[PDB]
């Protein structure tokens, strides 16, 4: 059920309004590679999102 972790985390990345396509691709690919890093990657995405608000 590693893909359920991917799916949940990926939708949370999709929810972020301020990432460009390059950045979305970066985080999604990292999630795709290793779902156990989701909590960390989301934190990183949210921080980057907010800095680009």
């Amino acid at each position, epitope marked *: *059920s590693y*893909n*359920d972790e991917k*799916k949940l985390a*990926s*939708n949370e990345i999709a929810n972020l309004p301020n990432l460009n*396509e390059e950045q979305r*691709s970066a985080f999604l*690919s990292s999630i*795709n590679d290793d779902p156990s890093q989701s909590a960390n990657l989301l934190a990183e995405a949210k921080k980057l999102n907010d800095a680009q608000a």
Partner: antibody
Amino acid sequence: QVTLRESGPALVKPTQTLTLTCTFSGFSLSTAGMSVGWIRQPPGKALEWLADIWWDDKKHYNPSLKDRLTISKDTSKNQVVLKVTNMDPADTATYYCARDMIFNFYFDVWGQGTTVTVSS
Amino acid sequence: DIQMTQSPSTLSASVGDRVTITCSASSRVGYMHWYQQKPGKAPKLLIYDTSKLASGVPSRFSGSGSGTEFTLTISSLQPDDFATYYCFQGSGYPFTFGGGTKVEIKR
């Protein structure tokens, strides 16, 4: 809207390698989170997932295919190619390609399928 | 890997009947999806994320479940519901399908 179309030989000999091509429209495989997968269905049997490829070039293969599979993409041309080595009459089937997304993990649009027969 | 058994494998019901197909998985998945396949056609997404209706799918269709036990329901069987239905899990690789349930119409 999204459409996919499989193409390849209708007939291949035992031991030969099969090359199938999926050509699609309505979406791009360079889009973040996008994927194409391949599924087959022997006459009168259930569907069996074979492989998938992701926009980031990540690939997965079904162990049931015993390392016989190679998948690749040409994002430029909206094509995904699947190769299957050492074909056997047990591989006679209709072969489908279909779109997946990392937000979904389900195939939401499929091609019409292309029928392959393995015979001398 | 994760495998699924559907029951029944063959089903015969009259028009207007309510029909239920079950899918039991060998281990817990977060979602079950369902495909409908008509004779000579590719599978078509029917239910996704366990209970969500795919586009162009009548309210007649519904899905339920959680853990290892999922069901697809058709609330008023119509002639055009003649098909084989497959459950599908994308929660773990390899992706897998149930063995299918052929739905026949009594008349």
